[PDB]
Design a protein around this ligand. Structure first.
Ligand SMILES: CC(=O)N[C@H]1[C@H](O[C@@H]2[C@H](O[C@@]3(C(=O)O)C[C@H](O)[C@@H](NC(C)=O)[C@H]([C@H](O)[C@@H](CO)O[C@]4(C(=O)O)C[C@H](O)[C@@H](NC(C)=O)[C@H]([C@H](O)[C@H](O)CO)O4)O3)[C@@H](O)[C@H](O[C@H]3[C@H](O)[C@@H](O)[C@H](OCC[Si](C)(C)C)O[C@@H]3CO)O[C@@H]2CO)O[C@H](CO)[C@H](O)[C@@H]1O[C@@H]1O[C@H](CO)[C@H](O)[C@H](O[C@]2(C(=O)O)C[C@H](O)[C@@H](NC(C)=O)[C@H]([C@H](O)[C@H](O)CO)O2)[C@H]1O
Length: 451
């Protein structure tokens, strides 16, 4: 803590994050402003775009020189990082680079955030955040012209990868008396020795914009951009990361808010390589293997997306109000979209159920006279870091029919399958690290396109 900023009380992480923050980009009524107490100024150019963020709206940048945000560092923070420790933390969302783009822009490195005066592949001093292929780069440069750099390679499985259009949380801490550490989602991804460079003298503006990017199509989103005047520690990091994740909103596979009337494919967290298939209208659902995509020469692979059943969420009692956002604790009707029709998902009174308890879900059941329970509550009962949802079924008396999940079993002469069910069993295993009632809601997205 020798080169850290504040000098008061080294115990309360919550209070430490606040007191040590020196720049803080928040967005309110469509304006980006600094919300640390320093009131640095931010100038939002004309083509800076706002999109859903992990908690309110975020900044979306596209590839024209008029899509940018500038921060004019205030008087009393202007120089902080010339010698002291600083930490930069932000949420990022980069689209899965298409294999074509990996071929033709894979050696093109460009910035998205930078404190460092630029000129025709010649650089000032300061730092930048840059992308080159599927690499995320941190980069410190000092008055003498000396550089320190971290290069984090994204894993080759894009379903899991940090640079494949999911929101991820970046934090970079630089302790001038030791290292620069690169974290993603609270984990240490990369690091380098920064002992030895002196005097980081940079631009008086922090700049948000794509810089020297060859692909006319790139975009990226940045939220909650923040500068602390210290190398935060991982226990500080963990707390900073989870603080952004308030349960009150459910999220889609990408980290964006869960909405009604929109098509999502279901993929189970515990079985991420499966899609949902349906036996027949009126019948059960089961897990089947999704088709996968590999490419050797590019070192990349993913299970493909956009097949299996699409579902749609609707409010139980719906009509007049304005929130298209599914709140955890909301009661919904779940439907399957198959040829323009909406077939509600439910469990009919007395439908088979393994063992009398794991109730086999049914798509489109219509047996006259037979009650069909379809009131669901979508909830976030665990695993906050994972953008996943749980779904609870009720019968028509407000008794619980269980969380939605699967159960291996056999039905008639179809083969062994993992059939979708509703069961109260899950409710005793809620601390498990992996659970079978955990769902990803996946909407089509510009950022992910199967090649
Ligand atoms: C199906 C099941 O195992 N559990 C369902 C549960 O059923 C019970 C019952 O057994 C009980 C029990 O759990 O309730 C009670 C029983 O007294 C004890 N045994 C003793 C004396 O302790 C067993 C025991 O604890 C079981 C665990 O359940 O463990 C052993 C075992 O001793 O038998 C442990 C052993 O190491 C295992 N061996 C091996 C090599 O793995 C075995 C073995 O796996 C099992 O024997 C078979 O899998 O388990 O627990 C049932 O035994 C009972 O069965 C009925 C039977 O179904 C029925 O046919 C029979 O009727 C018949 C006679 Si006749 C056909 C000749 C006419 O009647 C008997 C008795 O009634 O049913 C009980 C009903 O209550 O019931 C609940 C309902 O709420 C659930 O169905 C349980 O299943 C879970 O369902 C979830 C979704 O609904 C998931 O699918 C779970 O699956 C995952 C998961 O966690 O989601 C799926 C994962 O892929 C899987 N991964 C891995 C790595 O395994 C996991 C994993 O299996 C477990 O999480 C633990 O690792 O499950 C379902 O598990």
């Amino acid at each position: 803590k020798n080169l850290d900023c504040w000098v008061d009380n080294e115990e309360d992480i919550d209070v430490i994050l606040k007191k040590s923050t020196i720049l803080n980009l928040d967005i309110n009524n469509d304006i980006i402003s600094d919300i640390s107490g320093f009131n640095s100024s931010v100038i939002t150019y004309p083509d800076a775009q706002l999109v859903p963020g992990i908690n309110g709206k975020a900044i979306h940048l596209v590839n024209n020189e008029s899509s940018e945000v500038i921060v004019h560092k205030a008087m009393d923070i202007e120089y902080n990082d010339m010698f002291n420790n600083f930490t930069v933390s932000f949420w990022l969302r980069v689209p899965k680079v298409s294999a074509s783009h990996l071929e033709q822009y894979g050696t093109n490195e460009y910035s998205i955030i930078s404190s460092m005066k630029k000129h025709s592949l010649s650089i000032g001093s300061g730092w930048s955040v840059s992308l080159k292929g599927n690499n995320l780069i941190w980069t410190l440069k000092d008055s003498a012209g000396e550089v320190r750099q971290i290069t984090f390679r994204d894993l080759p499985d894009k379903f899991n990868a940090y640079l494949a259009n999911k929101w991820v949380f970046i934090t970079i801490t630089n302790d001038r008396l030791s290292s620069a550490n690169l974290y993603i989602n609270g984990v240490l991804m990369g690091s380098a020795e920064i002992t030895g460079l002196g005097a980081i003298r940079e631009d008086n503006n922090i700049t948000l914009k794509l810089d020297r990017c060859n692909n006319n199509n790139q975009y990226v989103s940045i939220d909650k951009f923040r500068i602390f005047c210290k190398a935060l520690n991982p226990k500080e990091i963990e707390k900073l990361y989870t603080s952004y994740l308030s349960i009150t909103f459910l999220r889609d596979f990408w980290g964006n808010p869960l909405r009604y009337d929109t098509e999502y494919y279901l993929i189970p967290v515990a079985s991420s390589s499966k899609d949902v298939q349906l036996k027949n209208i009126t019948d059960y659902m089961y897990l089947t293997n999704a088709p996968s995509y590999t490419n050797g020469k590019l070192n990349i692979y993913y299970r493909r997306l956009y097949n299996g059943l699409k579902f749609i969420i609707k409010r139980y009692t719906p009509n007049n109000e304005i929130d298209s956002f599914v709140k955890s604790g909301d009661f919904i009707k779940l439907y399957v979209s198959y040829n323009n029709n909406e077939h509600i998902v439910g469990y009919p009174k007395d439908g088979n159920a393994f063992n009398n308890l794991d109730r086999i879900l049914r798509v489109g059941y219509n047996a006259p006279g037979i009650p069909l329970y379809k009131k669901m509550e979508a909830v976030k009962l665990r695993d906050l870091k994972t953008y996943s949802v749980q779904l609870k079924l009720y019968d028509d008396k407000n008794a619980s029919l269980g969380l939605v999940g699967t159960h291996n079993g056999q039905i008639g002469n179809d083969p062994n399958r993992d059939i979708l069910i509703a069961s109260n069993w899950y409710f005793n295993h809620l601390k498990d690290k992996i659970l079978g009632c955990d769902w990803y809601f996946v909407p089509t997205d510009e950022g992910w396109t199967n090649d």
